[PDB]
Symmetry: C4
Subunit: 248 residues, 4 copies
């Protein structure tokens, strides 16, 4: 550390298992992320069965912003130790941090002038994206992201073949299960749900074929789901085994 | 290109990533196929909740035939550049193209003189087989077809063993779940649906055993389904990994 | 063929792809087995909706016995060409043949003097075991039998661990889902069905947990089902790949 | 055996396939373990449909205490033949032995002074943990325990990644399926049940999405369940095959 504090605090940020301040910072950031997400889960769950976010959610507000505050300041700390400050901002981790921290300020701006319920649930949904801040803490998430980036073509073919099979089988089932007495196959988009439930070997029973023609193609769909889905599964797993092993 | 335009346009057809006209033709064919299938999906989805194919389906007609028209002319182009014209027609891709383009003309001939609903749904089902025209655009579908052709014996054994197990377990369940109060196991063909749902580990709950004898054999069927199905799954996937890798 | 017809007809029986009489015998035996099983399936499927086995089942009788007759005589032929006649009888294929042919004669003896319905459904269940007579025709069935015999210890451990996990999870679910309003977990044996449905990732929805304690252990059971079942799955498949490849 | 009886009876305990006294002790303990767990299952299955534990449980209590007494005395014999008696107690095998016999003695103390139903079912739940005493008899269970310990990090990542996906998908599903007419997605913890069932490709149909937004994310959850769960499955199986093979 022959120069200013930037590099000697960045080495603590980049390597949290060294020194003692880095470990404390790592633990406190992890604890704050965990407590924030647990608080969100808890607040999601007499005149009525009022949830824990109407009579409460004063402290659940302050607590939340406290966590957010910490995130902001630590992000500022990560802006005070980056030789590649602009490139660091362009990095995926900085993007995840910004996506995690923006909802609170966006909601504050929205509630400063007027208030609408259209972005309320949207912002609350985006608020859970602070789970992904555990990527720094856990190596497994980084390995999973690396594998998903590596086999990008395999996921593309997975999506393309899945959409193709879904369209084909939904069309077949809709045209084979249209004249039933009480049929839920009102359209091909309404048969997309049944096709994706059957292909993944999930099964729900809400939408089932009630015709001989629809049962024959309702069982081939299940077999074709195994064939289509299980082609890119090994390559994702093999990449995970290869990348994780090569890091050792 | 020392000779006529046939070979110099076939090199563009066979290789769409070369030149600039070939890329435009490839993109326009892909876009037309996609818009045709999306139009079919959309048209499949006050006096009544009238779908988008009764008040509409004038433009949905013309649009459709426009796509069909393009297919026809491009097929004619593929007939103007094939040194193996007859052999090219005998190829699988040409068969797929004719299967995709025939429904429209067949329906026109049928509606020219009288009209019946027997072939209406059949032709509408056949119309979605222009999805398979994406085989030229996507290498993954070609690899999948090559693998399915290569491991033809394993698929045959899959079908044979699946039919054998289905027959055995359907007979056992029908004769074990026949005397129930309100039983849907009226016959072995009526137990084929339950057997194929249970073997594929899908589960629907519409048809479940309600007897101790039927529950014992209704759980062995689920385990036997995993054993039977998972034998040819690796060989299909291994061939896909081998063929795709050997192309690189 | 320097000696009597026994060996020169056994070489046709053992090798059905040689000569021309052996191929005809192989095809006729396969056709008779297939028509017998199809006849059983069909006969299993106004005053009432009478099945095809009450107004019918005279020709369905004669047809059936005809098939049985053929089996008997061909078995006699296999007794006229075996140098190891006693050892051949001790073979698994001969046991399968006797198991397939006995039901008819046993039923004839039973119906000769009095008649009971206790053994009626049992004999009809045993009647489908002529499906296994396709082992001679299909090499895949023989390979599957060889693999199942080879990894006998792995199937034993599969059964033991499956029973252990089923007992543990059924006890936990019964004692966690006992005090519900309308609970189908009346006893530990009654929770065996739910446990085996959940472990195999099948799902039916007839028996589901309705308590927080029962839901936590109702989801661990599903994960533990994947772990237990997927341990002997590769070894069965790997043996199938190894044995089938080594035959080539 | 140049010294006292401790070692010459310990070799029978550690190696039950040697001599003849060890084999008798090996089978007699397994029979009493088997009959104990069967009795626990059986006891759970006019004024009312009284189970077999109220009119009975005068012979069952004697039967149960007979098994426990054998378990205790054989544990004491293992304490009279262990050179590492203090270390042997700390072993995992001895821990299971104490856990198997503790509920019976704790229950006797509990019922001596007053009686409560809070620990009545809790002690009965612990009573099935004598199933794990089969680890000595079965080599597969010992290997299964070794492989779960070997890949402890992979299971640690499985729990962390699964909690990651469960929380992320439940939050999306809860907010997308909240304004339905009769929705069971009352809260994120109430949506944890749906997520874990969907991810494991199980399917129950009690909780299903009824909105277009909830169906899109209700199908990605099923695909993401396969991706997350199938990462540590091969390493558990590969370790099991490797450890089992290296034992031979």
């Amino acid at each position: 550390p022959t120069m200013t504090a930037r590099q000697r605090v960045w080495r603590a940020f980049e390597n949290p298992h060294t020194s003692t301040m880095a470990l404390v910072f790592y633990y406190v950031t992890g604890f704050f992320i965990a407590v924030s997400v647990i608080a969100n889960v808890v607040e999601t769950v007499h005149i009525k069965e009022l949830p824990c976010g109407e009579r409460y959610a004063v402290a659940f507000f302050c607590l939340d912003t406290a966590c957010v505050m910490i995130f902001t300041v630590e992000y500022l700390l990560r802006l005070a130790a980056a030789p590649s400050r602009y490139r660091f901002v362009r990095s995926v981790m900085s993007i995840i941090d910004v996506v995690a921290i923006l909802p609170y300020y966006i909601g504050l701006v929205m509630t400063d002038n007027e208030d609408v319920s259209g972005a309320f649930v949207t912002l609350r949904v985006f608020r859970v994206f602070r789970i992904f801040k555990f990527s720094r803490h856990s190596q497994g998430l980084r390995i999973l992201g690396y594998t998903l980036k590596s086999c990008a073509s395999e996921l593309g073919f997975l999506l393309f073949s899945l959409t193709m099979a879904i369209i084909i089988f939904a069309t077949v089932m809709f045209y084979a299960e249209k004249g039933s007495s009480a049929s839920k196959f009102t359209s091909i988009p309404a048969a997309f749900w049944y096709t994706i439930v059957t292909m993944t070997t999930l099964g729900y029973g809400d939408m089932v074929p009630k015709t001989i023609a629809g049962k024959i193609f309702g069982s081939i769909c299940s077999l074709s789901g195994v064939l289509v889905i299980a082609l890119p599964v090994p390559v994702i797993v093999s990449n995970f085994s290869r990348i994780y092993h090569q890091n050792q």
